[PDB]
Motif scaffolding. Structure first.
Motif, PDB file in Angstrom:
ATOM      1  N   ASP A 251       1.003  -1.101   0.001  1.00 19.63           N
ATOM      2  CA  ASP A 251      -0.070   0.035  -0.156  1.00 19.63           C
ATOM      3  C   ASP A 251       0.883   1.452   0.008  1.00 19.63           C
ATOM      4  N   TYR A 252       0.980   1.983  -1.132  1.00 19.48           N
ATOM      5  CA  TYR A 252       1.882   3.105  -1.599  1.00 19.48           C
ATOM      6  C   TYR A 252       0.763   4.180  -1.525  1.00 19.48           C
TER       7      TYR A 252
ATOM      8  N   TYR B 123      12.335   4.501  -9.202  1.00 15.75           N
ATOM      9  CA  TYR B 123      10.971   4.375  -9.772  1.00 15.75           C
ATOM     10  C   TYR B 123      10.456   5.627  -9.041  1.00 15.75           C
ATOM     11  N   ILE B 124       9.576   6.400 -10.074  1.00 18.04           N
ATOM     12  CA  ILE B 124       8.525   7.354  -9.260  1.00 18.04           C
ATOM     13  C   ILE B 124       7.639   6.696  -8.598  1.00 18.04           C
ATOM     14  N   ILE B 125       7.720   7.010  -7.136  1.00 11.92           N
ATOM     15  CA  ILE B 125       6.523   6.466  -6.087  1.00 11.92           C
ATOM     16  C   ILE B 125       5.584   7.379  -5.654  1.00 11.92           C
TER      17      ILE B 125
ATOM     18  N   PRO C 285       1.169   3.495   3.916  1.00  7.67           N
ATOM     19  CA  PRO C 285       0.656   2.505   4.921  1.00  7.67           C
ATOM     20  C   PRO C 285       1.430   1.452   4.819  1.00  7.67           C
ATOM     21  N   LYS C 286       1.859   0.570   3.707  1.00 10.16           N
ATOM     22  CA  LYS C 286       2.242  -0.710   3.860  1.00 10.16           C
ATOM     23  C   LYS C 286       3.386  -0.610   2.613  1.00 10.16           C
TER      24      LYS C 286
ATOM     25  N   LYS D 143      -1.825   1.936  -6.491  1.00 14.48           N
ATOM     26  CA  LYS D 143      -1.287   2.270  -4.937  1.00 14.48           C
ATOM     27  C   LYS D 143      -1.325   1.089  -4.113  1.00 14.48           C
ATOM     28  N   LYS D 144      -2.487   0.452  -4.340  1.00 14.89           N
ATOM     29  CA  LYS D 144      -2.513  -0.702  -3.133  1.00 14.89           C
ATOM     30  C   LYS D 144      -3.238  -2.064  -4.037  1.00 14.89           C
ATOM     31  N   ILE D 145      -2.667  -3.098  -3.533  1.00 21.09           N
ATOM     32  CA  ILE D 145      -2.930  -4.251  -4.053  1.00 21.09           C
ATOM     33  C   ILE D 145      -2.495  -5.535  -3.013  1.00 21.09           C
ATOM     34  N   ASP D 146      -3.315  -6.517  -3.181  1.00 23.04           N
ATOM     35  CA  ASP D 146      -2.995  -7.821  -2.391  1.00 23.04           C
ATOM     36  C   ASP D 146      -3.564  -9.048  -2.866  1.00 23.04           C
TER      37      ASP D 146
END
Ligand SMILES: [Br-]
Ligand SMILES: [Br-]
Ligand SMILES: [Br-]
Ligand SMILES: [Br-]
Ligand SMILES: [Br-]
Ligand SMILES: [Br-]
Ligand SMILES: [Br-]
Ligand SMILES: [Br-]
Ligand SMILES: [Br-]
Ligand SMILES: [Br-]
Ligand SMILES: [Br-]
Ligand SMILES: [Br-]
Ligand SMILES: [Br-]
Ligand SMILES: [Br-]
Ligand SMILES: [Br-]
Ligand SMILES: [Br-]
Lengths: 114, 112
Positions: A19-20, A106-108, A39-40, B14-17
């Motif tokens: 989770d970026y 890498y662009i984040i 967050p992750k 952004k978010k993946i699982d």
């Protein structure tokens, strides 16, 4: 596309969980952006982050705690002489791959007010 | 590269699982592969799966429950006329994206 990248990655590595989502934290006064929290983050290896403000390279730093929940906060005060960044400027953050001489990145995240 | 795909995807979505580790389940006798289970599939779209055995396309199916844990078992008996597939054959499984007239798909598992 998001879809192609997702399934190309899935077939190659099978499992991933990240989770970026960029959470931008403000300073004092609130017109300054002081930090960026994800967050992750991935935590398999020691990633670093480069911060670039209006095209100016502020360099690379890695000493940001990863919380047991997986969160990591990049503190811009560590790159910008103890001040955050005016929210009228463009902030680019790049994840930098270790053991690479800071060459693979890498662009984040990008802050650009509108 | 895996690394490049990871971070291109992270910046975009952004978010993946997910967990598409391919668990191949056997039948009776045990030389038959009856199914394929993924521990945590994506559930944002109604995905289907196309199955190919030794290059013979058995077509598409989607009637496979997703469990609360996010798991999903593709039962090959639903494609192969009530029989599993001999483990000496190659099995390819493609995930098919909905609302593309079945034209957009990606390899998602291979048994060889
Ligand atoms: Br896209
Ligand atoms: Br604020
Ligand atoms: Br560093
Ligand atoms: Br300072
Ligand atoms: Br300073
Ligand atoms: Br500034
Ligand atoms: Br990039
Ligand atoms: Br962003
Ligand atoms: Br997800
Ligand atoms: Br499973
Ligand atoms: Br279907
Ligand atoms: Br059926
Ligand atoms: Br059938
Ligand atoms: Br039949
Ligand atoms: Br068969
Ligand atoms: Br596979």
């Amino acid at each position: 596309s998001a879809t192609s990248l997702t399934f190309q990655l899935a077939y190659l590595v099978k499992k991933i969980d990240f989770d970026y989502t960029p959470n931008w934290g403000r300073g004092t006064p609130s017109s300054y952006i002081d930090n960026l929290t994800f967050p992750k983050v991935l935590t398999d290896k020691k990633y670093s982050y480069r911060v670039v403000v209006n095209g100016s390279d502020l360099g690379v730093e890695s000493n940001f705690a990863v919380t047991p929940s997986g969160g990591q906060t990049i503190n811009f005060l560590q790159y910008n002489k103890g001040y955050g960044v005016a929210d009228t400027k463009t902030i680019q953050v790049f994840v930098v791959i270790p053991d690479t001489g800071n060459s693979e990145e890498y662009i984040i995240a990008e802050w650009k007010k509108t």
